[PDB]
Amino acid sequence: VFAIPPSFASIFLTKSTKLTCLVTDLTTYDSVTISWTRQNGEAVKTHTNISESHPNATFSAVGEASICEDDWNSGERFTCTVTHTDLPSPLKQTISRPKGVALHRPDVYLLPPAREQLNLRESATITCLVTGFSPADVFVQWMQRGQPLSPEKYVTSAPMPEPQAPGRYFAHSILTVSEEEWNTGETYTCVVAHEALPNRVTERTVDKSTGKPTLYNVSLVMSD
Amino acid sequence: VFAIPPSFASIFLTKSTKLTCLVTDLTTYDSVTISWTRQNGEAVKTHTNISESHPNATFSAVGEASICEDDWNSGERFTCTVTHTDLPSPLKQTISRPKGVALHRPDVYLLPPAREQLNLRESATITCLVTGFSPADVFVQWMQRGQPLSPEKYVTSAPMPEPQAPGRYFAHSILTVSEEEWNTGETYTCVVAHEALPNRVTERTVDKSTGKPTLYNVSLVMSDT
Amino acid sequence: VFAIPPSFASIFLTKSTKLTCLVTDLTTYDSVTISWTRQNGEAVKTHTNISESHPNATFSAVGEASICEDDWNSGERFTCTVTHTDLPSPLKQTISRPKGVALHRPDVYLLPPAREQLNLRESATITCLVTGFSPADVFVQWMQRGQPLSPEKYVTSAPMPEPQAPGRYFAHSILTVSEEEWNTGETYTCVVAHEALPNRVTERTVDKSTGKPTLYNVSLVMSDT
Ligand SMILES: *[C@@H]1O[C@H](CO)[C@@H](O)[C@H](O)[C@H]1NC(C)=O
Ligand SMILES: *[C@@H]1O[C@H](CO)[C@@H](O)[C@H](O)[C@H]1NC(C)=O
Ligand SMILES: *[C@@H]1O[C@H](CO)[C@@H](O)[C@H](O)[C@H]1NC(C)=O
């Protein structure tokens, strides 16, 4: 039983707590009885979709269901309870939110693309710096002029431990853009969804003029 | 029955979807029969923190229920039933989340205080003109470098209709601060919450340095001759 | 066989290809023997750092053997063979460098810390953006004033595929350093190592004066009343 806990990025991106149950190393048995349950074993929410053939060269299914938000936010456990003849007993591989961690709010610092990149003019990379968050999960998206970009446009690194603070984690998000989009001056906004934020999302924006000084526009116009 | 459907400000700020069907204008008795019938008539949840015996004689039956957000977002019909001991006919009040209202995002513009106000150096007001949003309520909150301010320090306006654009709404939110805090450059972030933004929440930032234009356009021409 | 190939970070930092093996998930129980093939049958040398008996792979041993740097590239097939009550004959766990990969030169940027970090004054994070490479674990090593900094101070991202590139990949390397150390000059340099580099190393430097303009030194001074 490899039932997946509802990761926070999935429950924030879809606004629906999906608890799935992909039973790995399954056989050629389509009679799998996936009977979901909790510790309060009543009004159980069954699956709604069936998966297909997987890299294990057999037939498997999924146990995707819609649960409420505040049960997992409180810490209510769930068990897929895969009742099968191959298992000797239905395995009670429960999934929940084990609490007991601190809640450090991330501080996102939008790093503009380097001047060495902008001289090469073939591309530009804007790196969001999500750092100092004690739960590991962040859901980072990029929005340009108020409209979110494609998921293929940006890549978010998996959160790795911070050097100085062991409890805090850092993460990265690179948005690769063409250089002429950057010299246009369009504002690129980084939205970071991490749970310790008071509004549960912070937006910071970046544009070519955010490194320029506000008061003095000191130009250097050459002459013959 | 003074039934109050949950607005967005109660749900977003609390993070809790609580519904109230408080009965009023009747002396407090043991005739509490509110049961929160769903679209199928199923019961939901009991109520604990009942109302008081006011001079107006309000009933102590609040009908608080921590109803699921994943149940309320579908917007199905909720009917309150009050099967009174004297009157067996229930007081049927239907309520559902309205759907099909045209989702337009707010255009939060945070306006710094006027120079005529900063000349007084006694109280400064910072206003966010959340404007252009059509689906009814918005929740405006003020944070200062990640620390939210007290609700007794800011007052948001009620959502009034837009002057020129039909079917929209606008909402002000002022923040009465002192000019020492404004002059020291303390960043004030008006953050709004509305179910029409792409991420349902946007923030805007204001500083003393935000309003200053490029006052000194130095043009160092060299090697002319 | 739990064989760990020495990736290019190991063969660059230690200057020696260390043929890490283990008897994990082998039916051998006690007094294991290690055998290695250089594809001519002559590669094995028993080394130190032998781990001890734990319930998975009892009486374990590593298969570390110092074969030169050219050979791993030249594609010697490397198997770790134990002759006991586990399988002695099949040694199909043969691992060498892949023969043809799209070698792409890591064109590396040093992104200076954002001004918000320097305004927080607690720490300054310098990211060594490495983009465009076969992921040979570019060994992104950080040296300040010639001497290498500690491996604890810098954290390097595992390589992840580039979004707008088919066979190029990116990496990141953050050196978390104090804000006072950044302000006072203190060039932090960044070397990133890869096979596709012409000298196997490119380096870049960053400072407070890196993003500053060079012909004009424009300052701004308040005589505040
Ligand atoms: C600021 O200087 C740049 C330098 O080329 C110029 O293009 C721009 O028009 C200037 N803006 C203002 C507002 O003076
Ligand atoms: C600022 O100076 C630049 C000199 O290159 C000039 O082109 C621009 O028009 C000036 N802008 C203003 C607002 O004076
Ligand atoms: C201008 O130059 C002086 C000394 O020549 C230096 O102290 C100062 O930092 C420079 N200004 C800026 C903005 O770096």
Curated annotation (Swiss-Prot), chain A:
CH4 as annotated region, ranges: 101-210
The Ig-like domain, residue ranges: 6-96, 106-207
Region annotation (CH3) ranges: 1-100
PTM section of the record: N-glycosylated; important for IgM secretion and its localization at the plasma membrane. The interaction with FCMR is glycan-independent.
Signal peptide: none
Disulfide bond annotation, renumbered to this chain: 21-80, 128-190
Effect noted on mutating residue 207 to A: Blocks IgM BCR assembly
Positions of glycan attachment: 49, 56
Protein task: Constant region of immunoglobulin heavy chains. Immunoglobulins, also known as antibodies, are membrane-bound or secreted glycoproteins produced by B lymphocytes. In the recognition phase of humoral immunity, the membrane-bound immunoglobulins serve as receptors which, upon binding of a specific antigen, trigger the clonal expansion and differentiation of B lymphocytes into immunoglobulins-secreting plasma cells. Secreted immunoglobulins mediate the effector phase of humoral immunity, which results in the elimination of bound antigens.
Disease annotated for this entry: Agammaglobulinemia 1, autosomal recessive: A primary immunodeficiency characterized by profoundly low or absent serum antibodies and low or absent circulating B cells due to an early block of B-cell development. Affected individuals develop severe infections in the first years of life.
Quaternary assembly: The basic structural unit of both sIgM and mIgM molecules consists of two identical heavy chains and two identical light chains; disulfide-linked. N-terminal variable regions of the heavy and light chains form the antigen binding sites, whereas the C-terminal constant regions of the heavy chains interact with immune receptors to mediate effector functions.
Protein name from the UniProt record: Immunoglobulin heavy constant mu
Organism from which the protein derives: Homo sapiens
Span of the entire protein shown here: 224 to 433 of 474
